[PDB]
Amino acid sequence: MTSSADLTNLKELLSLYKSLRFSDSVAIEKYNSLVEWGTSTYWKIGVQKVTNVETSISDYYDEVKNKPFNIDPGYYIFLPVYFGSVFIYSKGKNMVELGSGNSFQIPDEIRSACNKVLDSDNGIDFLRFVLLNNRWIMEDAISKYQSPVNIFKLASEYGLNIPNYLEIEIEEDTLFDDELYSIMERSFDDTFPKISISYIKLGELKRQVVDFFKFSFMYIESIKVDRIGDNIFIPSVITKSGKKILVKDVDHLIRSKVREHTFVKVKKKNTFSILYDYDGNGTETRGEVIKRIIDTIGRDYYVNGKYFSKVGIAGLKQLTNKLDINECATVDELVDEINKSGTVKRKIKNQSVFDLSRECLGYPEADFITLVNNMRFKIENCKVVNFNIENTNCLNNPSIETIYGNFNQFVSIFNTVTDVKKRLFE
Amino acid sequence: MNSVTISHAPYTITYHDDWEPVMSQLVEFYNEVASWLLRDETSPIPDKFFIQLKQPLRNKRVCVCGIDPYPKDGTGVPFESPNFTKKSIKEIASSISRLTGVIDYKGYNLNIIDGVIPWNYYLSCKLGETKSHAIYWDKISKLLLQHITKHVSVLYCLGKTDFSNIRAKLESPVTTIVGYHPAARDHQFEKDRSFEIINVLLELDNKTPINWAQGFIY
Amino acid sequence: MDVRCINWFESHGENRFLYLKSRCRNGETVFIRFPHYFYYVVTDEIYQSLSPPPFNARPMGKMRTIDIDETISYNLDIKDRKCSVADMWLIEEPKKRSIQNATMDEFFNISWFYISNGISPDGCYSLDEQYLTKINNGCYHCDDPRNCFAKEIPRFDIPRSYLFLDIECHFDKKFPSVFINPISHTSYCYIDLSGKRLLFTLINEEMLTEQEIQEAVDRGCLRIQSLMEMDYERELVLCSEIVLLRIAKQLLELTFDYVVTFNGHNFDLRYITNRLELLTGEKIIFRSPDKKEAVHLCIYERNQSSHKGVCGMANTTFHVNNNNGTIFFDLYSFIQKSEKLDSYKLDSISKNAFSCMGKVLNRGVREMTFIGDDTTDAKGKADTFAKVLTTGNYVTVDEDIICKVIRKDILENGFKVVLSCPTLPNDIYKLSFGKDDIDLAQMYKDYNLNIALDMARYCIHDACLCQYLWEYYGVETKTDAGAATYVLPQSMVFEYRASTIIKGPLLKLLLETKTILVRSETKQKFPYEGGKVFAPKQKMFSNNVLIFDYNSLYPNVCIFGNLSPETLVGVVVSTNRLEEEINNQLLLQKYPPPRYITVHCEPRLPNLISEIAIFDRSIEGTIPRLLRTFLAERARYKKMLKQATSSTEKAIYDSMQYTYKIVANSVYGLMGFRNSALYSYASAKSCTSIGRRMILYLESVLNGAELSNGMLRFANTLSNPFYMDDRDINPIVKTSLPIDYRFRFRSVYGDTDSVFTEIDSQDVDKSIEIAKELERLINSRVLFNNFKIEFEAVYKNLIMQSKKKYTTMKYSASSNSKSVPERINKGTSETRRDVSKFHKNMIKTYKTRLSEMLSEGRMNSNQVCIDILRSLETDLRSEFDSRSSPLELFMLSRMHHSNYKSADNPNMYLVTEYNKNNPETIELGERYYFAYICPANVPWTKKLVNIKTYETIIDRSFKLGSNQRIFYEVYFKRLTSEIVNLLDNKVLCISFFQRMFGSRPTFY
DNA sequence: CGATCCTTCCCCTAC
DNA sequence: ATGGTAGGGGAAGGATCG
């Protein structure tokens, strides 16, 4: 490290080279630039020059067990692999669902502060946060370390997950069957939906997950969504004569593109039946199912944005809810409270009016950008007075149609925020 | 080990099979040069010019390269002195002792380390003088360096000024790394490159690093 | 003490110094030695806060340290440029570094020396003999050059000395080796300060028999046995090889102003040094003027071969390490860097240089006499031909048969030469130098007196060709002009690129305007490409075409828009149309158009959809001022050139004007290069955008323009496309043209700095007059500020092949209808160096014939189309069957620059196989004459045997009675492709090619 | 009763 | 010691699907 060893001979490049399996896109472009500049250097020449943009963790896992197999003797730690949107990271970045690079930022500052920067060796190499809808739960880490230590102890230390990682010396090799599986499930003592149990013994990294198929044949009655909160609702499909039948459909409304009504195959283990998401091809029709979902709901709940359109809701109160301030009925009180607030004033001065309104109405990013980019305006006095459509192809998407329908309320809130900003600093 | 017969002095050169596809050409280049090369005394004896030709090239991954043999007491083996008195070898031993921590040095024979081949760009030099056979050994040196660099993985040349255009002399840039000479001269003064970039470059190409401890003599 | 400077050079010893070589009026050479300092620039606080005063310090004054870092903005909240004013100080340190915090560190030490000391590298001065110290005869030492060079005087002429030499060495089969092959002949063209010209050739006597040596001595030659017995006044001298090498060493060790060779750094000087070292062991030693440093010849290499992609390993240059004045110039590198339209073997260097008439006088037997004078073809060419004929042996009068000179006479501004060739009745000729068809290897095996004398004559001819090439290109005047314009030593003007040579005038401008522009953020590399290629409107032009050219468009754009890194107020980007509209509304009001200028640019990133850069036009930035200075001084030098009388002044001014043109033309490219001192991404993009906008404006106003009733009516309103102005916008103007004129106009093609307009007329005089009137009216009325156009030429029979590819005939503006036009091609295959020599002639003839027949068909489109198709098919079939009769030429060229993945690489394998065996040894970066067709490929069925596999190099040999190397009709299908750009009805085109080759020709 | 011709799809080289 | 990206034309060469 005399002359800095050229950043320890590209220590970050080596880390990304060994971390392709648990990396993110920005690191991929950074590594590409690093190899491109390193291949032509007075202190470094050509390298292996391998690139990848897909995040996969199948290398650290084994085949799934689908029958009451037999297990080798030894001490085991049982992990209740839940059913949620898996996230992998090491610090306050990444958290990518196997390819959806930085889809959104979870607003948990306490969680981010609590998580140590590269805890133990390399930050347990990933967190496996299921986040069923919005609840943070940690899971397997595969990283060796020691196991009864920080890796599994982080959940108990910071309260992220209920302590279900405690077991006893098992040994005495026996055939792992339904009875032991149910006994371990009851010993877990959890109410969250669990889909698998992964056993870890001292001295290994890759575990053989077990999952009993129990293929059942059931009919579908209707698909109905139920609201739990602001972006907390789940499209809980109900089949048979009102059965629950769990479906993945986490936050973002994909993998639920199943054919309406008809006959379906489902998987049930002890209490929570789960059907297929995208494995069984069959028909996988999307336009018909999206139109049926929209019609049943009542022309609301645009699919792409995983949210519901603010039909009828003009404004003057949704801004207060978004900014998390006291309820106000007049612009003057809004201005006074924003001035009084220590951080709301900073957050409204730093951000732009367009971004503020877009976040207030909860519109999708790409869809709204495209819809704006295919429209014409009549801006007067820094406010929107008249708008029109130029290309009608983008109207083919129902979500774009709903956003265009509520664009009037969007314009009203945009003008309100512009007036507030003008009255604050001018 | 195959053998070849040349027109001048030793009449017999023994070489390993790894040097097969260039040896003949070397002879075609050597004979003419010999007609003048024996005109003057040289620090290496002619019998030790091609001693390094017996070392196999299949199990070598690091090639350390110099510019010329020692002006006096030419043993034939590059950077070799079985008396711990030459400046370059003692400087390298001191540097490796500082970096690793091994003590009680009685020699640092580099030809016995697995995966590392000691090489000299010019196979001869005038006795008691600097490099004076550059014109004679030019094509032979280029041919031998081209042959070696196609088998080894990393090349480490000693001397910035001497190897200022080492990339131009070789058509294939096979990890050209140029380092300062142990003996500082000609507008240069540097002695500590940490001697560890080679290993990390080796596992950067899915190759086993080389331990810098097999060369110690006790 | 009046002196004129000749060279500035340094020393690479223990202590560095700067040397001046200069000449007085009488002719005495004076050397002056200056200390070599390292210059740093600091603010007042940094200078005062540094404890030990290192060597010296002088004040500068109040200066600004404006920050030129540019960042994108998503709103109109642009604060200001970070600009601070402070007192500055200049620090001199003999050692490498003493500050480590200098603001100005991108400039050279020599530029600082010159500008701070106010010294011009090629100026005439009156030295003061009070700050100089005598240390040795002819040398002085100066410690305070600031006032030692205070007085300047007008230029005065001084004598100079030159040395041109050539070598020839024995070889058996191919390239010689210094260990086994000796030297036979060495020629010298010694020119002294007194002007005496001495030609003399040294011949090796070790390769001759005793009786032949005695015969040579008896018939006029001189024999010597030592250096002291050598006399330069004798042409032919006979001696041993050791004495030859020692004489060469003695000659190269003397202080010549120039030593000019052709490929001498790589071959001649290296061979001489190696052979001298082998035979004796001594060295060729150069010593400094103060007798304190001594070095030897060691030809080193410079591998500066990267034009950011557009080069095949370009070329590696070879230089010598002399520490005296002795400018060692290599014409091989200079010509290679100058012209790229020939082959480099000293056989066709100056063929495309001269044109003169060679009227025949007699046609008897084999002793034809040719004459040449200024009254035949032109002035000057006859004089140059007579000058080069004094040593030539084989003469070319625009014939390709090669003739031997019998008798030569030099008459008053003319020559009379007697050739030896079969008689032939021609009347007019073109005069240029020739080539020698002799076999040196065959001559060396049977060596006798006549062979030695002929070889000596050839060597002296080559040595004199070196001088003739040096004089023809005006290298000395170019060097002086480069030293004057570019603030640099006279010995390094041709060895640096645009990024280095522009730091002198830029430093002068910064010092005079007190600006220290500095960058504090890392640069991001993302090219904007640029495009700007326009698709031609039509393919064939039966009517006439006029050409209008912009006078230095890009410098004028940079001046008009005030595009400098320090004038950019800010750049605004938008990811959506709502914010784009908001920003546009705020921008048209915050920055009024009369003062600020807003330029729309292509988005930097895919998410962005707009990008507007704002420039302030009231502070007179750096780049516009530099370009204005360059243009004004170029105009001044052109006026002085046209007002000068003596030939030397004409040459000097002509040399200066194009150096200023070159320095002005390189700024636009420099603004887009990351490693430049003028780097500005936004400024370069804005310059390209404004250039495109001006081109579009001119094309739109010129399109659809009529000339009815002597009135010039434009299609659209004449308005400034950037902001509103007070100029009239009426699209109808008065013309000083006859009322009877009735014509229409249309724009067909455009370029970066050019516009083509279409006129529905055939006459040339009327077209020229209307073009002049259009130029006047458009310059006075249409354009604005400093944007002027010029009428270049009239293009007839214009044929557009693709984008940036056309062929036509050109009538100059200063010409009439009776003047002869000039054939001009841009991008056509005739300008390519790797197509053919027969193909070019055939396509030229076919293009001319088709142009004539479409000019006068004349029934209609399809009838003339089918007529041309059938006629061309019949002609090409008649010229297809070669009925044996092996023709000449059929030769191609390419550069040996592969240096790529091994694999198979037939082109690399073909060359290296012949190099290792014997014939055609080509170095790296050297073009060679070969003929490639299907390199071991079988595309279809040939006619005879041994046709498709033909890949032999063949340098000068002739193919034997079984090769039959004529199958270039494969590429000749370009005519069919040409028909694509000329006519329709592909059905006839497909059938013929299918019958002959059957490879489904690609239409368009 | 049949295979061809199609365009990318690449490497090399020239403004 | 360093301007620069698109466009054009020749040709292997498996893919193409004939």
C492, closest nucleotide (Cα–C1'): E1
Exposure on the CB side of residue C461, measured as CA atoms within 13 A: 20
What whole-number distance in Å separates Cα of residue C806 and Cα of residue A226? 71
Class for domain B57-203, per CATH? alpha beta
Q: Is C162 left (phi over 0), alpha (psi -120 to 50) or beta?
A: beta
Q: Are A163 and A155 in contact (CB under 8 A)?
A: yes
Asked whether strand E has any atom less than 7 Å from the CB of C312, the reply is: no
Whether A339 and A414 share a structural domain: yes
What whole-number distance in Å separates Cα of residue C1002 and Cα of residue C1004? 6
By Cβ distance, the residue of B33, B165, B171 closest to C301 is: B165
Q: How many CB atoms lie within 10 A of CB C925?
A: 18
Q: Would you call C180 an interface residue with chain B, using a CB distance cutoff of 8 Å?
A: yes
CATH number of C162-338: 3.30.420.10
What whole-number distance in Å separates Cα of residue A289 and Cα of residue C507? 71
Q: How many CB atoms lie within 10 A of CB C16?
A: 14
Q: Which chain A positions have a beta carbon within 8 Å of C579's beta carbon?
A: 352, 354
| Helix, strand or coil, per DSSP, at residue C456 | helix
B91 residue type, one letter: E
Chains in contact with C, counting 3 or more C-beta pairs less than 8 Å apart as contact: A, B
What whole-number distance in Å separates Cα of residue B162 and Cα of residue B185? 11
Residue A309 lies inside a defined structural domain of this protein? no
| Order of all β-strands in the sheet with C754-759 | C732-734, C711-713, C705-706, C744-750, C754-759, C544-550, C789-802, C805-812, C822-826
Which of C74, C75, C577, C609 is the best substitution to test chain A (most A C-beta atoms within 10 A)? C577
- Start-end of H helices in C166-301: 210-218, 241-252, 269-279
What whole-number distance in Å separates Cα of residue A167 and Cα of residue A79? 10
Fold exhibited by the domain C522-553+690-827: Palm domain of DNA polymerase (3.90.1600)
**Strand C2-10 with C124-126, pairing:** antiparallel
A341 residue type, one letter: S
* CA of C994, C1' of D5: distance in angstroms: 14
CA A153 from centre of chain:
24
Task: Please judge whether B165 and C303 are an interchain contact, meaning their C-beta atoms are less than 8 angstroms apart.
Answer: yes
Q: Is C861 annotated as a binding residue?
A: no
In terms of C-beta distances under 8 Å and separation of at least 24 residues, what long-range contacts does A361-366 make, across chains too? Answer: A361/A310, A361/A318, A361/A406, A361/A409, A361/A410, A361/A413, A362/A230, A362/A231, A362/A305, A362/A307, A362/A310, A363/A305, A363/A403, A363/A410, A364/A302, A364/A304, A364/A305, A364/A399, A364/A403
Burial of C22 (0-12, 13-18, 19+ CB in 10 A): buried
- Start-end of H helices in C227-349: 241-252, 269-279, 331-338
In terms of C-beta distances under 8 Å and separation of at least 24 residues, what long-range contacts does C720-724 make, across chains too? Answer: C720/C784, C721/C693, C721/C694, C721/C696, C721/C697, C722/C593, C722/C597, C722/C690, C722/C693, C723/C593, C723/C594, C723/C597, C724/C593
How many domains is chain A built from? 3
Residue of B nearest to C315 (CA): B168
A244 residue type, one letter: K
Task: Please give the biggest Cα pair distance in chain C.
Answer: 101
- On strand E, nucleotides with any atom < 7 Å from a protein CB are 1-12
Residue nearest E6 (alpha carbon to C1'): C531
Domain boundary (A297, A327, A352) is at A297
Q: Do domains C162-338 and C522-553+690-827 have the same CATH topology?
A: no
Q: Is C963 left (phi over 0), alpha (psi -120 to 50) or beta?
A: alpha
Two structure tokens written together for A394: 């983008």
C835, closest nucleotide (Cα–C1'): D14
CA A293 from centre of chain:
22
What whole-number distance in Å separates Cα of residue C751 and Cα of residue C792? 14
CA distances (Å), origin C119, targets A160, C495, C853: 76, 22, 65
**What is the DSSP code string of C615-647?**
EESSS--HHHHHHHHHHHHHHHHHHHHHH--SH
Name the CA dihedral angle for A93, A97, A103, A104, rounded to a multiple of 10 degrees.
-60
Residue from C469, C261, C262, C463 nearest C384 by CA: C469
Helix axes C986-996, C861-878, angle to 10 degrees: 10
Task: Please judge whether B206 and A48 are an interchain contact, meaning their C-beta atoms are less than 8 angstroms apart.
Answer: yes
What whole-number distance in Å separates Cα of residue C60 and Cα of residue C513? 12
What whole-number distance in Å separates Cα of residue C924 and Cα of residue B168? 11
Asked whether strand E has any atom less than 7 Å from the CB of C973, the reply is: yes
What whole-number distance in Å separates Cα of residue C805 and Cα of residue A191? 76
User: Where are chain C's structural domains?
Assistant: 2-158, 162-338, 352-434, 522-553+690-827, 861-996
Residue A92 lies inside a defined structural domain of this protein? no
Which of B155, B197, B207 is the best substitution to test chain A (most A C-beta atoms within 10 A)? B197
Q: Which helix (H) or strand (E) holds B4?
A: strand B2-4
Q: Are C54 and C47 in contact (CB under 8 A)?
A: no
Residue A242 lies inside a defined structural domain of this protein? yes
Q: Are A268 and A368 in contact (CB under 8 A)?
A: no
Two structure tokens written together for C628: 């204005």
Known catalytic membership, residue B68: yes
Residue nearest D11 (alpha carbon to C1'): C905
What whole-number distance in Å separates Cα of residue C746 and Cα of residue C704? 5
C713 residue type, one letter: R
Residue A76 lies inside a defined structural domain of this protein? no
Q: Would you call C579 an interface residue with chain A, using a CB distance cutoff of 8 Å?
A: yes
CA distances (Å), origin B205, targets A17, A47, C772: 11, 7, 69
C557 residue type, one letter: V
Asked whether strand E has any atom less than 7 Å from the CB of C658, the reply is: no
DSSP assignment, residue C369? E
SS (H, E, C) A265-301: EEECCCCCCEECCCCCCCCCCCHHHHHHHHHHHCCCC
Alpha-carbon gap: B71 to the closest alpha carbon of chain A (Å): 30
Alpha-carbon gap: C311 to the closest alpha carbon of chain B (Å): 16
Task: Please judge whether A352 and C74 are an interchain contact, meaning their C-beta atoms are less than 8 angstroms apart.
Answer: yes
DSSP assignment, residue A20? G
Q: Is C454 annotated as a binding residue?
A: no
What whole-number distance in Å separates Cα of residue C293 and Cα of residue C738? 78
Instruction: Name the residue range of residue A221's domain.
Output: 215-297
Q: How many CB atoms lie within 10 A of CB B114?
A: 13
Q: How many CB atoms lie within 10 A of CB C87?
A: 15
Q: Is C928 annotated as a binding residue?
A: no
- For C85, phi and psi rounded to 5 degrees? -115, 135
Residue of B nearest to C96 (CA): B187
Decide which of 2.40.30, 3.30.450, 1.10.10, 2.60.120 is the CATH code for C352-434: 2.40.30
Q: Would you call B205 an interface residue with chain A, using a CB distance cutoff of 8 Å?
A: yes
Q: Which chain A positions have a beta carbon within 8 Å of C575's beta carbon?
A: 369
DSSP assignment, residue B126? B
Q: Which chain C positions have a beta carbon within 8 Å of B35's beta carbon?
A: 179-180
Q: Are A206 and A227 in contact (CB under 8 A)?
A: no
Alpha-carbon gap: B189 to the closest alpha carbon of chain C (Å): 14
- On strand D, nucleotides with any atom < 7 Å from a protein CB are 5-6, 11-15
- For B65, phi and psi rounded to 5 degrees? -125, 135
Q: Are C587 and C593 in contact (CB under 8 A)?
A: no
Residue nearest E1 (alpha carbon to C1'): C304
Whether A279 and A221 share a structural domain: yes
The owner of tokens 């300092």 is C37
Cited resolution, angstroms: 3.0
Contacts of B65 (CB under 8 A, 6+ apart): B119, B120, B121, B145, B155, B156, B157, B158, B163
Chains in contact with B, counting 3 or more C-beta pairs less than 8 Å apart as contact: A, C
Task: Please give the biggest Cα pair distance in chain B.
Answer: 50
Residue from A136, A133, A75, A145 nearest A110 by CA: A136
Strands (E) located in B100-185: 115-120, 154-158, 176-179
What whole-number distance in Å separates Cα of residue A354 and Cα of residue C577? 11
Active-site position among B18, B40, B68, B205: B68
Q: SS3 breakdown of chain B: % helix, strand, coil, rounded to 5?
A: 30, 15, 55
Cα dihedral across residues A335, A337, A340, A346: positive or negative:
negative
Angle subtended at Cα C793 by Cα C790 and Cα C794, rounded to the nearest 5 degrees: 130
Number of A/B CB contacts below 8 angstroms equals 32
Residue nearest D7 (alpha carbon to C1'): C1002
Beta bridge partners, C200, equal C188
What whole-number distance in Å separates Cα of residue C727 and Cα of residue C593? 15
Interface of B with A in 5-64 (CB under 8 A): none
- For C608, phi and psi rounded to 5 degrees? -70, 145
Q: Are A274 and A195 in contact (CB under 8 A)?
A: yes
What whole-number distance in Å separates Cα of residue C135 and Cα of residue A165? 92
Burial of C503 (0-12, 13-18, 19+ CB in 10 A): buried
Task: Please judge whether A14 and B175 are an interchain contact, meaning their C-beta atoms are less than 8 angstroms apart.
Answer: no
Q: Are A138 and A127 in contact (CB under 8 A)?
A: yes
| Helix, strand or coil, per DSSP, at residue C79 | coil
Burial of A297 (0-12, 13-18, 19+ CB in 10 A): middle
Task: Please judge whether B36 and C278 are an interchain contact, meaning their C-beta atoms are less than 8 angstroms apart.
Answer: yes
Task: Please judge whether C179 and B171 are an interchain contact, meaning their C-beta atoms are less than 8 angstroms apart.
Answer: no
| Helix, strand or coil, per DSSP, at residue C496 | coil
Q: Which chain C positions have a beta carbon within 8 Å of B165's beta carbon?
A: 301, 303
Q: Are A418 and A322 in contact (CB under 8 A)?
A: no
DSSP assignment, residue B53? G
Q: Would you call C674 an interface residue with chain A, using a CB distance cutoff of 8 Å?
A: no
Residue of A nearest to C609 (CA): A373
Q: Are A65 and A210 in contact (CB under 8 A)?
A: yes
What whole-number distance in Å separates Cα of residue C39 and Cα of residue B176? 35
Q: Would you call B177 an interface residue with chain A, using a CB distance cutoff of 8 Å?
A: yes
* CA of C316, C1' of D9: distance in angstroms: 34
Exposure on the CB side of residue C138, measured as CA atoms within 13 A: 14
Domain boundary (A297, A328, A362) is at A297
C971, closest nucleotide (Cα–C1'): E10
* CA of C735, C1' of E2: distance in angstroms: 52
